[PDB]
Design a protein around this nucleic acid. Structure first.
Lengths: 297, 297
RNA sequence: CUAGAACCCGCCAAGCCUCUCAACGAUGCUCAAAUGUGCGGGUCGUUUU
RNA sequence: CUAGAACCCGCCAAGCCUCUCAACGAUGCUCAAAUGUGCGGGUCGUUUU
């Protein structure tokens, strides 16, 4: 394997280099300040759509500006916040629904603590390590007063669901043995069991993309969502590409229409796409005429 | 220790219970739907300010409504998003500043990989476990093409800083041996070294509070920030309580005024506080007349 | 966890009439009700602005 | 990592004139420049709407 031949290039020589590659740059102090504080190689992933089609030569396509790179960066920054604000509601609702339906159909407050209610002890006794690792470090308002006051080993499920991560909760959900309980929890969110599990793991990954500031708008996905056969709500008609960012917005909208019927996620999406209108929608995977579908009315 | 005497109470039954505690409830189907989807014990932390001062009796203070509980919940939900949107800029800028000043003052692209540049190997060889654990699982666009193409063990710092968490980066920063480098990085953000380290750990904790949906607005903090003696910018004059949510906003504003001089964080904060005006500001730790300070002009 | 806790297609052990059938339980269903975390096979290489 | 990678106060090994001093290096500084991840001591119990 080849030794790496490139040195560190200073933020002044980077503007000299970028102007040698054909990128038009104006108000050069601002571009040097962005290259110092945001960085070259972070912005390189947004400069990449403006390279000309033999991209191995690293020359830009003509008539391009650095303000277009700032345009794409600020659009992706606003898009991740728009997705996160609506993920938060589902991330509360699934937790509450699991706790409530488990305590209703089991008849115990403490059902999350017993291995007899879960399918495989090989994952249950693994998850108990994460539960003990969170309760071994938590010092919050209600945890320590509970374990001062009360005898039993772990708090009942409405207490314990506040301090667990969402990737723990959706891993507890898949292990629930009595399938009538899983049917009831999936039936509250208007789906059968297997597409509900698939859309939970899509929601978890879409949250992970928003928390760690990854490139979102023209990113190829790889974990394909499942298509339900039985429905209790509005859905897509026109054929769409599954692995772009559009399908995740459709899944979040489908859960949101059951959680909050009077919601306004569409008007957020229109305000975002109209306000940053210089971006081609076909890279984001919306098919043309997406306003016509029953999910988005 | 006492055995726990409370059963699961059905979401129908809590409305009769809450109405027996004196809380006025109207449009009852909505309140049952919120108790099913958001949950009682999550909302209990926002019902708690409306309990009357002998709170051990669990009776509400008179003239209270459940819409006030929804008011406090929606304010805290909007406040965490307002804090996160401004934390993201600093979370990029500190990474870029560390990579750029290290590559400038060391003269190597690969300075993050060598133990001779860090103080204690007892933390460096610990952090190398996290670096290897991220590169052992990453499959992103640029990582795998680099390790196919090039010989050397880890990518240079502008590549590697994209895939590391912020708690890793601020733990790399404290270990840098040559103190002139630390002075240069702190001097770019207009502070001396020790309050810069203190404000980095306050920024990391304030991000952690926003990502996991914790109660924020009337929460007591415990990790007290440091007060700088040497300054290169505007700061507070009037004496303020350190351990409320106000001081974190002041630190984020101080970094933001150096990153982006034309920023608009006050226009976010005043619109938030005026739009949800039924909430007492003294619980949030703003002293009266906070508009008068040089930091907020 | 965005080559995965991914998607698809057949086969199996049990069971039942929501669908559909000349059959009245299979020519049906397993994403109705119920229920197992059964098995083999196959595609997917991470930015056209 | 919101009883901590927290804050505060003294003491030590080295060093230097940015401050300040009758001293021209201590009556100074260690959050100027430089530099060590040195030491002992002390407070902080996690929602008045």
């Amino acid at each position: 394997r080849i030794p790496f031949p490139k040195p560190y290039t200073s933020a002044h020589d980077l503007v000299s280099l970028l102007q040698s590659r054909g990128l038009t740059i104006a108000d050069t102090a601002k571009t040097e300040r962005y290259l110092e504080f945001i960085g070259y190689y972070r912005l390189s992933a947004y400069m990449y759509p403006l390279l000309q089609m033999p991209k191995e030569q690293h020359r830009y396509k003509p008539n391009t500006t650095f303000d277009q790179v700032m345009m794409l960066y600020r659009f992706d920054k606003k898009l991740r916040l728009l997705i996160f604000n609506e993920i938060e509601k589902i991330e509360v609702a699934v937790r509450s629904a699991i706790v409530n339906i488990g305590s209703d159909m089991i008849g115990s407050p403490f059902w999350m603590t017993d291995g007899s209610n879960f399918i495989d002890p090989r994952k249950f006794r693994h998850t108990m390590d994460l539960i003990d690792a969170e309760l071994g470090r938590s010092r919050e308002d209600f945890i320590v007063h509970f374990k001062q006051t009360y005898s039993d080993a772990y708090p009942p499920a409405w207490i314990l669901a506040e301090v667990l991560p969402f990737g723990v909760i959706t891993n507890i959900f898949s292990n629930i043995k009595t399938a009538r309980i899983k049917k009831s929890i999936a039936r509250k969110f208007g789906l059968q069991v297997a597409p509900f599990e698939s859309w939970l793991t899509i929601v978890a990954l879409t949250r992970n993309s928003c928390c760690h500031h990854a490139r979102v708008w023209n990113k190829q996905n790889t974990i394909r969502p499942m298509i339900p056969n039985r429905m209790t709500g509005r859905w897509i008609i026109l054929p769409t590409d599954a692995l772009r960012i559009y399908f995740n917005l459709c899944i979040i909208k489908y859960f949101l229409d059951i959680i909050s019927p009077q919601n306004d996620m569409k008007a957020k999406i229109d305000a975002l796409l109209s306000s940053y209108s210089s971006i081609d929608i076909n890279a984001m995977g919306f098919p043309r005429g997406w306003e016509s579908e029953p999910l988005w009315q």
